[PDB]
Design a protein around this ligand. Structure first.
Ligand SMILES: Nc1ncnc2c1ncn2[C@@H]1O[C@H](CSCC[C@H](N)C(=O)O)[C@@H](O)[C@H]1O
Lengths: 262, 265
């Protein structure tokens, strides 16, 4: 009579923690969602094979509207697991489901997994220097989101790095690329004109973190806005004031222009 | 010809990823450091038994001064694993080692694992609202550092949450408690008097993140400063104005006073 929120990690089925695996292997029913992020290095089958359980994949509507109709009932009589990409409570509204579980008399436990939020440490930027985070959202119809722009502004002023989660439309197999994010930013720039994001702004791109060879690139928007960073998912970062060791790593590992060394 | 940066996880020997465990098992040499942090929910022996290989422990001096002598050599002609708590490279300094590797013609790869940086999401606080992070350090001798205080002020001023790492003597295995951290911040409030941390400030304590039964508590400093949060490690969080969804979670899951639903939203 327990509900487990278990993370699957960054890239493939092996990014799950051993704790999460051994617990998933012994659950009676296993649910999961694959709309909050993209695990580009695996498939349901490989996940199922590793866990030895048939997994019922839920949609965003299933979760946000009928979680307590689809999952909780079984959770009151069995040991249920809910799987998600990366870490279940990072950049999702899943924490709310724990409130739903409690109100339903069901106990919930959380098993963490590698998250993009801390994986960005592989870019060499100091994790403690990241300020507020934001999401670059696809424009829909006449609605054109722009708040992420101000977030970068506020952080840069304080000399802090800005982490930008990129949009996703899982039902349409759409995963926003770093390129699309920059394009959208340049457009917000020409509208608000704040000297926040331009052709000369330094950005860091991290693609498919969790794989053995992720794409880690650093340079000026003018040089990267057209570069191919590989298949999604992608994460875009607008660094603030760089420490020497940070820029060095960016040069040695992310192939950044040495003109940032001064 | 390869060097593996493998993260060990949050608490115990099972917090490493399947990927990290299988790769470590296939490595010829396995190293480990426990001076950036410890793994309070387990032991070197338990980690060794799970990996099935001997683990040679490296000290700060071993790594920061002789990594090129002790590890890199073996990596040039073998598959070598370097194990560390949390997520590799989250610790400010380790990234530098990936540079040494490249120059020594040695491939290096990073195998990720959970970090408290993302694990704090279990507190119900939106990860995007976290601002600059800081470490609360013990005053010693004539030195009395107060920069973390300033970090809280700047983040809270912008409605952002502040993640505070608590001081740790890994070598001596000594943990600063959340209780002590609260006492220190109160003294800094007395010196700074900026109205950043007082008996009325709402804080969140997260202890033993990673274990199945962590301690998550939310409350006002006046009511938690003498509460027993259990065994270390302790992480202290000073949140900014709460989203109602956050306040609801802190009340229903972290036993926070209903009062936050109106006072801190
Ligand atoms: N492995 C990865 N590599 C690069 N970016 C990733 C990634 N995983 C997630 N992202 C970024 O994060 C966005 C989804 S938000 C969900 C993040 C997930 N809960 C976690 O903890 O990691 C993706 O659209 C992308 O912008």
């Amino acid at each position: 009579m327990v509900l487990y929120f278990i993370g699957l990690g960054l890239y493939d089925e092996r990014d799950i923690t051993v704790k999460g695996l051994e617990i998933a292997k012994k659950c009676d029913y296993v649910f999961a969602e694959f709309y909050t992020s993209l695990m580009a290095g695996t498939t349901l089958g490989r996940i199922q094979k590793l866990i030895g359980k048939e997994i019922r994949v839920l949609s965003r509507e299933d979760v946000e509207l009928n979680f307590e109709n689809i999952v909780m009932p079984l959770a009151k009589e069995n040991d249920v697991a809910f799987l998600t990409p990366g870490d279940p409570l990072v950049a999702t509204t899943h924490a709310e489901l724990r409130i739903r579980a409690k109100r339903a008399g069901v106990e919930s436990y959380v098993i963490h997994a590698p998250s993009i939020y801390s994986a960005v440490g592989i870019t060499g930027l100091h994790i403690y220097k990241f300020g507020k985070s934001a999401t670059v959202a696809y424009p829909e119809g006449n609605w054109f989101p722009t708040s992420y722009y101000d977030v970068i502004k506020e952080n840069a002023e304080r000399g802090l790095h800005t982490l930008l989660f990129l949009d996703i439309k899982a039902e349409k197999r759409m995963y926003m690329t770093a390129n699309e994010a920059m394009e959208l930013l340049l457009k917000v720039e020409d509208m608000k004109k704040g000297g926040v994001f331009t052709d000369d702004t330094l950005v860091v791109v991290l693609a498919r973190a969790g794989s053995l060879n992720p794409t880690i690139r650093a340079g000026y928007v003018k040089d990267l806005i057209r570069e191919d960073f590989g298949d999604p998912p992608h994460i875009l970062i607008v660094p603030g004031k760089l420490h020497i060791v940070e820029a060095e790593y960016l040069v040695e590992i992310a192939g950044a222009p040495r003109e940032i060394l001064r």
